[PDB]
Symmetry: none
Subunit: 108 residues, 2 copies
């Protein structure tokens, strides 16, 4: 009922939606990039896909990601991430039993 | 093109996202209503859920839908439904094969 609780639940559902659309066995490809670009604009989020080494592959708003959040993702953290106010949500992506990358959402 | 095609792209992706969120096996319940009220407000769209009889169950902006657009949905129409100059997008919802209703968006 809290506005903060609703904003967090909403970014969580968006991030999981987005991760469900990605081909995580082929992360760095044109098709996945388009999905992220189009979703980003339609859903009012900034979204980036990051590989396991912390390199940003593409994003709806440019090929960039907040360094501290990417560090958190590489360290194994998921869910709502720890900015200081600004809303962030990250999930790991997996293919055939192995981690292949991360998706990071910023609300926006 | 250009601001129009962007608008059409966004309402399509918003519609698909909202459709994914719904429990289509129990369309007329309080949980689904909440999902549409919350997500409709956060995405800044008007979204209504309609049963297979054309009855409007709930919407993010009140329990209404344009009558001619509901009729087109009941007729089997999907996608951009868009009248002259008002933007609409509609999708059927299914549970275990069976059609259980429709989601109708209008821009906002």
């Amino acid at each position: 009922t809290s506005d903060q609780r609703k904003a967090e639940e909403h970014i969580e559902k968006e991030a999981k939606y987005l991760a469900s659309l990605l081909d995580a066995g082929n992360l760095n490809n044109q098709a996945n990039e388009k999905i992220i670009k189009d979703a980003g604009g339609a859903l009012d989020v900034s979204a980036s896909v990051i590989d396991t080494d912390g390199k940003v592959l593409y994003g709806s708003n440019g090929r960039s990601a907040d360094s501290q959040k990417v560090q958190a993702l590489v360290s194994g953290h998921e869910g709502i991430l720890s900015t200081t106010n600004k809303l962030y949500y990250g999930l790991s992506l997996r293919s055939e039993g192995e981690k292949t990358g991360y998706v990071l959402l910023s609300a926006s």
